[PDB]
Design a binder for this molecule. Structure first.
Ligand SMILES: [Mg+2]
Ligand SMILES: [Mg+2]
Ligand SMILES: [Mg+2]
Ligand SMILES: [Mg+2]
Ligand SMILES: [Mg+2]
Ligand SMILES: [Mg+2]
Ligand SMILES: [Mg+2]
Ligand SMILES: [Mg+2]
Ligand SMILES: [Mg+2]
Ligand SMILES: [Mg+2]
Ligand SMILES: [Mg+2]
Ligand SMILES: [Mg+2]
Ligand SMILES: [Mg+2]
Ligand SMILES: [Mg+2]
Ligand SMILES: [Mg+2]
Ligand SMILES: [Mg+2]
Ligand SMILES: [Mg+2]
Ligand SMILES: [Mg+2]
Ligand SMILES: [Mg+2]
Ligand SMILES: [Mg+2]
Ligand SMILES: [Mg+2]
Ligand SMILES: [Mg+2]
Ligand SMILES: [Mg+2]
Ligand SMILES: [Mg+2]
Ligand SMILES: [Mg+2]
Ligand SMILES: [Mg+2]
Ligand SMILES: [Mg+2]
Ligand SMILES: [Mg+2]
Ligand SMILES: [Mg+2]
Ligand SMILES: [Mg+2]
Ligand SMILES: [Mg+2]
Ligand SMILES: [Mg+2]
Ligand SMILES: [Mg+2]
Ligand SMILES: [Mg+2]
Ligand SMILES: [Mg+2]
Ligand SMILES: [Mg+2]
Ligand SMILES: [Mg+2]
Ligand SMILES: [Mg+2]
Ligand SMILES: [Mg+2]
Ligand SMILES: [Mg+2]
Ligand SMILES: [Mg+2]
Ligand SMILES: [Mg+2]
Ligand SMILES: [Mg+2]
Ligand SMILES: [Mg+2]
Ligand SMILES: [Mg+2]
Ligand SMILES: [Mg+2]
Ligand SMILES: [Mg+2]
Ligand SMILES: [Mg+2]
Ligand SMILES: [Mg+2]
Ligand SMILES: [Mg+2]
Ligand SMILES: [Mg+2]
Ligand SMILES: [Mg+2]
Ligand SMILES: [Mg+2]
Ligand SMILES: [Mg+2]
Ligand SMILES: [Mg+2]
Ligand SMILES: [Mg+2]
Ligand SMILES: [Mg+2]
Ligand SMILES: [Mg+2]
Ligand SMILES: [Mg+2]
Ligand SMILES: [Mg+2]
Ligand SMILES: [Mg+2]
Ligand SMILES: [Mg+2]
Ligand SMILES: [Mg+2]
Ligand SMILES: [Mg+2]
Ligand SMILES: [Mg+2]
Ligand SMILES: [Mg+2]
Ligand SMILES: [Mg+2]
Ligand SMILES: [Mg+2]
Ligand SMILES: [Mg+2]
Ligand SMILES: [Mg+2]
Ligand SMILES: [Mg+2]
Ligand SMILES: [Mg+2]
Ligand SMILES: [Mg+2]
Ligand SMILES: [Mg+2]
Ligand SMILES: [Mg+2]
Ligand SMILES: [Mg+2]
Ligand SMILES: [Mg+2]
Lengths: 101, 151, 127, 98, 206, 79, 115
RNA sequence: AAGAACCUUACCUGGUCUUGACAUCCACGGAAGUUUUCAGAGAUGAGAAUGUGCCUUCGGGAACCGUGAGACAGGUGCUGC
RNA sequence: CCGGCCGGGAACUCAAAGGAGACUGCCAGUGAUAAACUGGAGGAAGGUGGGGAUGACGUCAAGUCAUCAUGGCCCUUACGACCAGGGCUACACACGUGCUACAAUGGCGCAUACAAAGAGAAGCGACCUCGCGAGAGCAAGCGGACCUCAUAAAGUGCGUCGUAGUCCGGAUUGGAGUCUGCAACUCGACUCCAUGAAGUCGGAAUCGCUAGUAAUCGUGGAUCAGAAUGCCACGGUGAAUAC
């Protein structure tokens, strides 16, 4: 699903784990209802944009691992709805038989 | 069904008037599966009917249902090619069920105030045969009597 | 001493205990009159106690959970018929011929894939 | 006491795993209630079967996660050491809890 | 196209899951991706070694891979040197330890992967698709099969229009879940295009 | 509308406005931040917001304050 | 039954009577009758004149009728003078709150037209 | 499409880059990194500090980084006839 | 102290595993001395019990080269690649599929009873305490038969409106906000306040549905930072009709 699109997703994952899985203090702790409400809260949202545009975990699309398909994803398997089926009825996802109730 | 002759489901009697005739009347009156609302209306109607008519409930409902009951109804059958109006003797199970539907169908219209009031008035007018339900049987007869030529 | 019958009409599962004594019917620490109000039929639980008379013979302590109104009321009807086993086959000859002891399995059909709800297909566009 | 809880995907791999862990405890140092079953988790998934269009056509899957308990009611010295370093049974997760 | 995967429908009943491990919802996804990384790698590396399937287990952070194969001597090599070379590189991408085991298969013509990989390999060497297909169908019935359906879809013979052609010899009851049917597919990348090769091998009734 | 914790402007647009206001009136500021709100100090400036394919000059008045910059730069053209 | 600009209802409960005022809804009306000290169940015919004058000063607190109509007309006319996206939306006769304008929009756009 | 504010995004506008964002090599220089400043819409370009490790053929290493060179990498471009 | 709270119990519901069971197996016609058909007992269930999965050879050179793989073909200072905006949400109009309606078997208030299924670690987030309310602070427990989202709603029971474009509808807009998020103007969701449109049952046509089904009420999940009237599941009440 375009090698560039898969390759730009590794920036988004690596660069997010660096900054905002650590520097959420800038948004969470500082922008809060307490004594820092004056210029300290203004300097937080000011300094939050100094960071790169990527890093925010909202900007990760979350696509299939094997192919890179953006749609049809499943968080349990980490796959597309096509590749989970290809892998399930084959013997790769443990315990995953056809349901019928 | 093409060749699948199977019988019908059994029904239940209504607690306060343990029977069958008016138990089905509740089902025809019902909308959206709300039997609690519908059954409260039929009791309310028959209690207001029994006060005015000066009879019981089963016999008050009977002397009312029989006055809107069809004897013969009109189907149309193409045996050979053409399309004409063939009257036929209605079956005893459908006979009273077809009457119940005409009482309720007339009660949808004729917007007095309450559903309990409207049924009570329709069944009261059915007793002295001058409602809309008796008119709907009267026309059904006229088709059968006029088109009696066809067997 | 103290006889028992289960009953479990439609998801709901009754638990009917029955003893020889008063005519009262206790249910989940509530009276039968106040627990089952105006809904459709209170006396579906008392239907099985007609061919075999109650009046002031058998007292009923019942417990039930699951389902709604008629699911529980019908589960009690089966629970009582199952519970009436103190005179084994003398009662069940007359009781079965009016239905009653038949479980009545019919549960809600699952939602089929593609269909909007069990049987309801969406619509049809033919151009 | 030690509440031992274990779960698996296969319903008939966990049975011998629960039988062996009870027997390597009951026989070696006494005491066991039994295999308490617990409710089975059924994580269903309803993926589209086709690669393009055909919303009506799907395949529905599930993964039965079968739980089991053991429950011993005395911290025995022979039993507590036999639980550790002596489990094995591949494809069967186990979590001892004091 | 409208037929269910014959392996997939029998996974609970007759056939076994190849990846046999439990995992909690957090790890499951990454544990399944690492499972694919070794399987993709180990299939491409051991090409001439003739591998049918790869069973993978994970008891308490220890990846026991199994390699079911027709030619076990080529997988091990001399003095189990290639097992140690596999054990190292597989253990890096997967997750810490490794325990590679090898299961021989004395009847290689009854395994669906090996028959399909044989036909595929033959198609790439300009062999006539019928002389590859029917020879595989005839060869495995003599040994001890009861079914052997074999489809070959694609261009085949350098044709303009594509055609699917199948030959079977015996009972191949696909709708029977009690029946053991080895099914597998493989892709023959010829000069004219891809040629798919499905194979069903009904061995036993239960 | 959103945001109680400080009306929002981009760092680059704030520092460009503060530098422009202290110096004096000059020319349209090429700015792409449509998202950014308008401050009282911006009144008088003719900043040019990016509509999509070009920059639209917007003379900021007393009223244009609580609103955002992209409101005065229609993107899609019709008839 | 003559409070504010208009309010002339009869045979109607007090809470629903005051909904007839522009600028007074259902919840606002209950705040009037709570502060005034009047039961919601009563109607204006049943009320006395001594109680109606207390309602007049109560609704005088809130902006109602032409005070409100002008406040709304000012705010809409303000937007159109700015020439903002909402203003362009208003004068063009098209829906404002980021709505779908392709299939529906009939309330703001009006009834159907020829092509 | 099992979910378009940005991302997704394949489209447009303008800015931009050509062994390239993603890969193994032939080899030149450096641990990797981390903190932090300036011009810019941002991509980017310019810095300033600190740190300077697992083996010694010690003209080298096994990774990582940034140069020049080509084998090339890349294409959600067309063809489901 | 009066709540499965308590020791305790291991009956029962439930939970799983391992199993019995239903086969025209049994009787009675009918059939042709057959298959079988009808009807009957026993039975929880009766003639494939209900439901699901399972889709023959092949058809439409059906769909997909944009999931992936893939032969050729074209592009390689651009048809490749990084970035800010914008756009995919445009709107004289036409259709498809829904939802909410047009009310009185109904609308709004107060008294309060009955589910099933699923979900959860940068998670789900109690009791609290602030708020008219979205929510906001402090934090309890739970990788769960325990802890939490979570009071199910139709349903009763009282009240009040009495057939009005209405106390029906709740569109559309103005203002004031809340959360998520680098960011909510293009272009989010929800909340409050005011606002109060079309609509009085729908032309020719026409669709689904044979019982826990249609109808109708809520409920959950997947994708998902946020963003369902869709999709996928779950249970409430529960009909009519089949000559
Ligand atoms: Mg690719
Ligand atoms: Mg996202
Ligand atoms: Mg049929
Ligand atoms: Mg079900
Ligand atoms: Mg659909
Ligand atoms: Mg269609
Ligand atoms: Mg049409
Ligand atoms: Mg047509
Ligand atoms: Mg096919
Ligand atoms: Mg299918
Ligand atoms: Mg133009
Ligand atoms: Mg008003
Ligand atoms: Mg309001
Ligand atoms: Mg919108
Ligand atoms: Mg962009
Ligand atoms: Mg360009
Ligand atoms: Mg083709
Ligand atoms: Mg085709
Ligand atoms: Mg096409
Ligand atoms: Mg062609
Ligand atoms: Mg005990
Ligand atoms: Mg016990
Ligand atoms: Mg005991
Ligand atoms: Mg027991
Ligand atoms: Mg027992
Ligand atoms: Mg079992
Ligand atoms: Mg037979
Ligand atoms: Mg016999
Ligand atoms: Mg016989
Ligand atoms: Mg005989
Ligand atoms: Mg005989
Ligand atoms: Mg005989
Ligand atoms: Mg005969
Ligand atoms: Mg005879
Ligand atoms: Mg005879
Ligand atoms: Mg005879
Ligand atoms: Mg007989
Ligand atoms: Mg039959
Ligand atoms: Mg059948
Ligand atoms: Mg069946
Ligand atoms: Mg079946
Ligand atoms: Mg069966
Ligand atoms: Mg075609
Ligand atoms: Mg492709
Ligand atoms: Mg295309
Ligand atoms: Mg080529
Ligand atoms: Mg070539
Ligand atoms: Mg292109
Ligand atoms: Mg679209
Ligand atoms: Mg729009
Ligand atoms: Mg939208
Ligand atoms: Mg509807
Ligand atoms: Mg409503
Ligand atoms: Mg209501
Ligand atoms: Mg209303
Ligand atoms: Mg209201
Ligand atoms: Mg709580
Ligand atoms: Mg709460
Ligand atoms: Mg306080
Ligand atoms: Mg409060
Ligand atoms: Mg909160
Ligand atoms: Mg709260
Ligand atoms: Mg759970
Ligand atoms: Mg709770
Ligand atoms: Mg919820
Ligand atoms: Mg719960
Ligand atoms: Mg009037
Ligand atoms: Mg009007
Ligand atoms: Mg009004
Ligand atoms: Mg009108
Ligand atoms: Mg009108
Ligand atoms: Mg209608
Ligand atoms: Mg007509
Ligand atoms: Mg509703
Ligand atoms: Mg819902
Ligand atoms: Mg969720
Ligand atoms: Mg819905």
């Amino acid at each position: 699903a375009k090698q560039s699109m898969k390759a730009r997703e590794v920036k988004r994952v690596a660069l997010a784990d660096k900054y905002f899985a650590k520097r959420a203090e800038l948004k969470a702790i500082i922008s809060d209802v307490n004594a820092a409400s004056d210029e300290d809260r203004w300097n937080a949202v000011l300094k939050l944009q100094t960071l790169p545009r990527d890093s925010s975990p909202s900007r990760q699309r979350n696509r299939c691992r094997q192919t890179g398909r953006p749609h049809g994803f499943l968080r349990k398997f980490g796959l597309s709805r096509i590749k989970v089926r290809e892998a399930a009825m084959r013997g790769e996802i443990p315990g995953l038989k056809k349901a019928s109730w | 069904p093409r060749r699948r002759v199977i019988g019908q489901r059994k029904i239940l009697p209504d607690p306060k008037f343990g029977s069958e005739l008016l138990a089905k009347f509740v089902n025809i009156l019902m909308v959206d599966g709300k039997k609690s609302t519908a059954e409260s209306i039929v009791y309310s109607a028959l209690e207001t009917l029994a006060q005015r008519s000066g009879k019981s409930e089963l016999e008050a409902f009977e002397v009312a249902l029989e006055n809107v009951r069809p004897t013969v109804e009109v189907k149309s059958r193409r045996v050979g090619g053409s399309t004409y109006q063939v009257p036929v003797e209605v079956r005893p199970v459908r006979r009273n069920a077809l009457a119940m539907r005409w009482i309720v169908e007339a009660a949808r219209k004729r917007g007095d105030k309450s559903m309990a009031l409207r049924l009570a008035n329709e069944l009261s007018d059915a007793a002295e045969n001058k409602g809309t339900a008796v008119k709907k049987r009267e026309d059904v007869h006229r088709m059968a009597e006029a088109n009696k030529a066809f067997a | 001493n103290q006889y028992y019958g289960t009953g479990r009409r439609k998801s709901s599962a009754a638990r009917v205990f029955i003893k020889p004594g008063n005519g009262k019917i206790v249910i989940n620490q509530r009276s039968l009159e106040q627990y089952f109000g105006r809904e459709t039929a209170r006396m579906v639980v008392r239907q099985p106690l007609e061919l075999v008379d109650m009046v002031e013979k058998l007292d009923l302590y019942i417990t039930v959970k699951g389902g709604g109104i008629s699911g529980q009321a019908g589960a009690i009807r089966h629970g009582i018929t199952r519970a009436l086993m103190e005179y084994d086959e003398s009662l069940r000859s007359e009781l079965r011929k009016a239905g009653f002891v038949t479980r009545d399995a019919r549960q809600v059909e699952r939602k089929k894939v593609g269909l909007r709800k069990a049987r309801r297909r969406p619509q049809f566009s033919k151009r | 006491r030690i509440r031992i809880r274990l779960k698996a995907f296969d319903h008939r791999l966990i049975d011998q795993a629960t039988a062996e862990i009870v027997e390597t405890a009951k026989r070696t140092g006494a005491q066991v209630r039994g295999p308490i079953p617990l409710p089975t988790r059924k994580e269903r998934f309803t993926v589209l079967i086709s690669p393009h269009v055909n919303k009506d056509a799907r395949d529905q899957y599930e993964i039965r996660t079968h739980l089991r308990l053991v429950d011993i009611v005395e911290p025995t010295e022979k039993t507590v050491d036999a639980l550790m370093r002596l489990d094995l049974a591949a494809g069967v997760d186990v979590q001892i809890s004091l | 196209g409208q037929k269910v995967h014959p392996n997939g429908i029998r996974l609970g009943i007759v056939k076994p899951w190849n990846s046999t491990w439990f995992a909690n919802t957090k790890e499951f996804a990454d544990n399944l991706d690492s499972d694919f990384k070794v399987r993709q790698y180990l299939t491409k590396e051991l090409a001439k070694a003739s591998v049918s399937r790869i069973v993978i287990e994970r008891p308490a952070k220890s990846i026991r891979v199994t390699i079911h194969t027709a030619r076990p001597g080529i997988v091990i090599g001399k003095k189990g040197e290639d097992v140690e070379k596999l054990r190292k590189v597989v253990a890096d991408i997967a997750g810490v330890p490794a325990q590679i085991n090898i299961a021989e298969v004395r009847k290689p013509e009854l395994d669906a992967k090996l028959v399909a990989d044989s036909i595929t390999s033959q198609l790439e060497r300009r062999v006539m698709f019928r002389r590859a297909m029917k020879r595989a169908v005839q060869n495995a019935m003599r040994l001890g099969a009861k079914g052997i359906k074999v489809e070959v879809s694609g261009r085949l013979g350098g044709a303009e229009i594509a055609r699917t052609e199948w030959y079977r010899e015996g009972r191949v009851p696909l709708h029977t879940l009690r029946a053991d049917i080895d099914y597998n597919t493989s892709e023959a990348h010829t000069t004219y295009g891809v040629i798919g090769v499905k194979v069903w091998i009904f061995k036993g009734e239960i | 509308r959103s945001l109680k914790k400080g009306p929002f402007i981009d760092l680059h647009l704030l520092k460009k406005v503060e530098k422009a206001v202290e110096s004096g009136d000059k020319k349209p500021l090429r700015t792409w931040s449509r998202r950014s709100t308008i401050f009282p100090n911006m009144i008088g400036l003719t900043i040019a917001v990016h509509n999509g394919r070009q920059h639209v000059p917007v003379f900021v008045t007393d009223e244009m304050v609580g609103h955002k910059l992209g409101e005065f730069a229609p993107t899609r053209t019709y008839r | 039954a003559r409070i504010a600009g208009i309010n002339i209802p009869d045979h109607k409960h007090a809470v629903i009577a005051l909904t007839s005022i522009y600028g007074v809804g259902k919840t606002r009306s209950k705040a009037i009758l709570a502060a005034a000290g009047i039961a919601e169940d009563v109607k204006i015919s049943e009320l006395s004149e001594g109680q109606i004058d207390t309602l007049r000063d109560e609704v005088a607190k809130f902006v109602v009728e032409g005070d409100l109509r002008r406040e709304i007309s000012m705010s809409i006319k303000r937007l159109m003078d700015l020439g903002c996206y909402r203003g362009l939306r208003h004068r063009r006769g098209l829906p404002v709150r980021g709505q779908r304008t392709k299939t529906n929009a009939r309330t703001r756009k009006g009834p159907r037209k020829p092509i």
